[PDB]
Amino acid sequence: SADAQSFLNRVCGVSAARLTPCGTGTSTDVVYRAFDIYNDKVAGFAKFLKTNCCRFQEKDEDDNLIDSYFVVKRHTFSNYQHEETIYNLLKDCPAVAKHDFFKFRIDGDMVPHISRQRLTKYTMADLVYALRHFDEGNCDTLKEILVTYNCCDDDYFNKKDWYDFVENPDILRVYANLGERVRQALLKTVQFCDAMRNAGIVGVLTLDNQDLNGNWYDFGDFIQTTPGSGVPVVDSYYSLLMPILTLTRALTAESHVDTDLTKPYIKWDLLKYDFTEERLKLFDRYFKYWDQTYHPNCVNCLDDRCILHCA
Amino acid sequence: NNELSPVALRQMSCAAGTTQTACTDDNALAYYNTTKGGRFVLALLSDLQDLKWARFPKSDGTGTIYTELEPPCRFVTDTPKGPKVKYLYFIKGLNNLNRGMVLGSLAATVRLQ
Ligand SMILES: Nc1nc2c(ncn2[C@@H]2O[C@H](COP(=O)(O)OP(=O)(O)O)[C@@H](O)[C@H]2O)c(=O)[nH]1
Ligand code: BEF
Ligand SMILES: [Mg+2]
Ligand SMILES: [Zn+2]
């Protein structure tokens, strides 16, 4: 053969990347994953099935499989030139996943591949769909995001009523261990939105294009404008994510003395009650490109649909 | 595949104003969205570089209204016939979605570099 083990060697490159195949040769891999769609035919936040992607895992020196997947994608040839002229501009932002574009001999042609380097197994839409569509007899995707990131152990799911808030109130501590993986994937969206504005790129940000590290990666429905005027559309990314920002207690590192989860707590003045200049600085740090006026004190709001927004 | 404006827009007509006061009969140009509601023009352009307010005409009788502008952003906007500079002020109070449809239509479907 050797036409299969050569692919495993072209997917790799300057990196070490001791990969192991997962799609049985030079073929793709079929997965069932959550997506946020809007394309003139379909619309919704639903679990669809993917078929255009080949996944290669990765093992470390000690020959143990780690959380690193190379996801090479097959598609048209006009996408190739369009996802390479937008990546060559958004490649200096540290919140963008490394891309590698090449052309390979599948059968009788030169077909193009786009490979993303060192992703995670799941996206941020897989974690949001799991906690908003909960089934206690179908929760395999949640019992893996919780074990892969050392929130609990595989023997924690043996006790019964472990998912219950009223019978096992210790599940609010196993969920709060995802609060810093989610808080650091909120600071990388505001870097990507800044880099997307200085370069002139316009596109909709959806949560299935940010893995569980904060890295972003589908630039195939973005347009290009003159530099300095780019418009990140973040309205189904923040709104769908909102119920997870208090369940996982994301902003619990803001109570510390340097926003460090190690240094001690902030000792506030006991006679202080305003907190309006720190409420407007928390909105700018995490929700910078959310385009709607925020009133910290709801006595300055404009109707009853503004009180509900700003509260 | 979240796509921005999966269907294109149309319409370009009428005028707007340059001098909050003047807007005598013909100043600048309005762009797009008849807007199902009735008439809601999303964006505005100009052949000049001076426009504070704009009394852009609209339907019914009270059509007169101050469709003011904000700090602009200009582009080469090369006309197929030749070069032509056009400063793009956006309708005051536009949200990031509408400025996406507008930008997508007049750049990807028009000749701009
Ligand atoms: N992060 C990650 N995503 C994966 C993996 N395997 C499959 N996926 C799915 O692949 C998608 C990547 O999107 P992409 O291929 O860039 O865009 P699309 O082909 O237009 O949907 C994610 O939304 C996931 O749902 C994996 O190992 N890691
Ligand atoms: F159509 Be995919 F979002 F690159
Ligand atoms: Mg995608
Ligand atoms: Zn308000």
Cβ within 8 Å of residue A210, ≥6 positions away: A123, A124, A185, A188, A189, A216, A217
C-beta separation of B9 from B101 below 8 A: yes
* B4 within some domain: no
Element spanning A233, H or E = strand A232-233
Structural domain for B73, as ranges: 9-111
Ion ligand 4: residues, CB within 5 A, are: A 295, 301, 306, 310
Bridge partners (DSSP) of residue A96 are A216
Place of tokens 């990388």: A188
CA of A307 to the centre of ligand 4 (A): 5
Q: How far apart are the first and last CA of chain B?
A: 26
Element spanning B102, H or E = helix B98-108
Contacts of B70 in chain A (CB under 8 A): none
Q: How far apart are the first and last CA of chain A?
A: 63
Distance of CA A198 to the CA centre of its chain: 22
* B88 within some domain: yes
Cα-Cα-Cα-Cα dihedral sign, residues B32, B36, B38, B42? negative
Two tokens, residue A8: 């495993």
> Is residue A189 exposed (0-12), middle (13-18) or buried (19+ Cβ within 10 Å)?
buried
C-beta separation of A310 from A294 below 8 A: yes
CA distances from residue B50 to A143, B66, B74 in whole angstroms, order as listed: 61, 15, 12
Cβ within 8 Å of residue A209, ≥6 positions away: A123, A216, A217, A218
A66 CB within 8 Å of a chain B CB? no
Instruction: Name the residue among B13, B110, B108 with its Cα closest to residue B57.
Output: B13
CA of B52 to the centre of ligand 2 (A): 41
CA of A220 to the centre of ligand 2 (A): 5
**Cα–Cα distance, A103 to A110 (Å, whole number):** 6
C-beta separation of B96 from A231 below 8 A: yes
The total of structural domains in chain B comes to 1
Query: How many C-beta atoms surround the C-beta of residue A222 within 10 A?
Result: 20
Two tokens, residue A191: 């870097």
* B36 within some domain: yes
The shortest CB-CB distance from B3 to any of A39, A229, A235 is to: A39
The shortest CB-CB distance from A36 to any of B2, B75, B103 is to: B2
Which atom of ligand 1 lies nearest, measured to the CA of A218? 16
CA distances from residue A282 to A237, A277, A287 in whole angstroms, order as listed: 18, 9, 8
**Cα–Cα distance, A175 to A247 (Å, whole number):** 7
CA of A123 to the centre of ligand 1 (A): 8
Two tokens, residue A234: 């973040």
**Cα–Cα distance, B73 to B112 (Å, whole number):** 14
Element spanning A204, H or E = strand A201-204
Name the 3-class secondary structure at A133: coil
Place of tokens 């340097």: A258
Instruction: Name the residue among A144, A140, A113 with its Cα closest to residue A8.
Output: A113
The shortest CB-CB distance from A231 to any of B2, B7, B100 is to: B100
* B55 within some domain: yes
Query: How many C-beta atoms surround the C-beta of residue B20 within 10 A?
Result: 13
Size of the A and B interface in Cβ pairs below 8 Å: 59
Concatenating the DSSP letter of every residue in A145-161 gives: HHHHTTSS-TTTTSSTT
CA distances from residue A176 to A179, A182, A256 in whole angstroms, order as listed: 5, 10, 16
C-beta separation of A165 from A134 below 8 A: no
Name the 3-class secondary structure at A119: strand
Query: How many C-beta atoms surround the C-beta of residue A196 within 10 A?
Result: 25
**Cα–Cα distance, A124 to B62 (Å, whole number):** 49
C-beta separation of A174 from A146 below 8 A: yes
Residue type, A219: F
Residue type, A285: R
Instruction: Name the residue among A94, A121, A122, A127 with its Cα closest to residue A250.
Output: A127
A39 CB within 8 Å of a chain B CB? yes
Cβ within 8 Å of residue A257, ≥6 positions away: A263, A264, A265, A266
Cα-Cα-Cα-Cα dihedral sign, residues B44, B46, B51, B54? negative
Residue type, A175: Y
**Cα–Cα distance, A33 to A126 (Å, whole number):** 7
In the β-sheet with B43-45, what is the strand arrangement from edge to edge? B12-13, B29-31, B43-45
Name the 3-class secondary structure at A2: coil
CA distances from residue B104 to A273, A284, B41 in whole angstroms, order as listed: 46, 27, 15
C-beta separation of B55 from B31 below 8 A: no
Place of tokens 């959806």: A206
**Mutation target vs B (from A37, A226, A236, A237; most B CBs, 10 A cutoff):** A226
Half-sphere exposure of A72 (CA within 13 A, CB side): 25
Crossing angle between the packed helical segments A187-198 and A279-286, to the nearest 10 degrees: 70
Experimental method: cryo-EM
Q: How many residues does chain B have?
A: 113
Is A235 close to B7, i.e. CB distance below 8 A? no
The alpha helices in chain A, defined as continuous H runs, are 5-11, 77-82, 124-132, 142-148, 171-175, 179-183, 187-198, 238-241, 244-247, 279-286, 304-310
Strand A201-204 to A232-233 pairing: parallel
Query: For the CA atoms of chain A, what is the radius of gyration?
Result: 22
Ligand 2 pocket (Cβ < 6 Å) reads A 218, 220-221; B 1
Q: What are phi and psi of A308, to 5 degrees?
A: -65, -35
* B3 within some domain: no
Concatenating the DSSP letter of every residue in B8-46 gives: ----EE--B-SSSS---S-BSEEES---TTS----EEE-
Residue type, B32: Y
Name the 3-class secondary structure at A25: coil
Name the 3-class secondary structure at A265: strand
Strand A201-204 to B12-13 pairing: unpaired
Query: How many C-beta atoms surround the C-beta of residue B36 within 10 A?
Result: 7
Residues of B at the A interface, defined by Cβ within 8 angstroms: 1-4, 6-7, 73, 75-76, 95-97, 99-100, 103-104, 107-108, 112
C-beta separation of A174 from A165 below 8 A: no
**Mutation test of ligand 1: which of A38, A50, A240 has the most ligand atoms closer than 8 Å to its C-beta?**
A50
Concatenating the DSSP letter of every residue in A54-103 gives: EEEEEE-TTS-EEEEEEEEEE--HHHHHHTTTTTTTTTSSTTB--EEEEE
Q: How many residues does chain A have?
A: 311
C-beta separation of B11 from B34 below 8 A: yes
* B2 within some domain: no
